[PDB]
Amino acid sequence: APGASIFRCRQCGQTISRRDWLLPMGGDHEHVVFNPAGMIFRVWCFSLAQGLRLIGAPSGEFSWFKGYDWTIALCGQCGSHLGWHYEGGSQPQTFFGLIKDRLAEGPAD
Numbered sequence: 001a002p003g004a005s006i007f008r009c010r011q012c013g014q015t016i017s018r019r020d021w022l023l024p025m026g027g028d029h030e031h032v033v034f035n036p037a038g039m040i041f042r043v044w045c046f047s048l049a050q051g052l053r054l055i056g057a058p059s060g061e062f063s064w065f066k067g068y069d070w071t072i073a074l075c076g077q078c079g080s081h082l083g084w085h086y087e088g089g090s091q092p093q094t095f096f097g098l099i100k101d102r103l104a105e106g107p108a109d
Ligand SMILES: O=C1CC[C@H](N2C(=O)c3ccccc3C2=O)C(=O)N1
Pocket: 034, 035, 036, 037, 061, 062, 063, 064, 065, 070, 084
């Protein structure tokens, strides 16, 4: 009965990812970053995620991960901004960077 298994959207409970899918990018699954608006994010990298809606076309502007282009990832259920999907890079080609404090962690479904 693990209690730290699944990540859900904090606002609505949509299933988003899993602890098993944490991805250590450059040696750490956690990356502390800031955007041009000065917002600090504690980003957890995941190999896979679900329940999101990726919005727009990819952009390389201000990417926190060298070689990757990003798209905003919203909760597909409630529209909460949960992070970004990264693509266009290498090893892996793609991954998700999700904002840790916008997820709730809990037992499996
Ligand atoms: O890797 C990334 C993801 C996108 C993120 N980003 C933002 O969070 C943001 C907010 C407002 C204007 C422009 C941006 C932007 O590039 C960012 O700065 N780097």
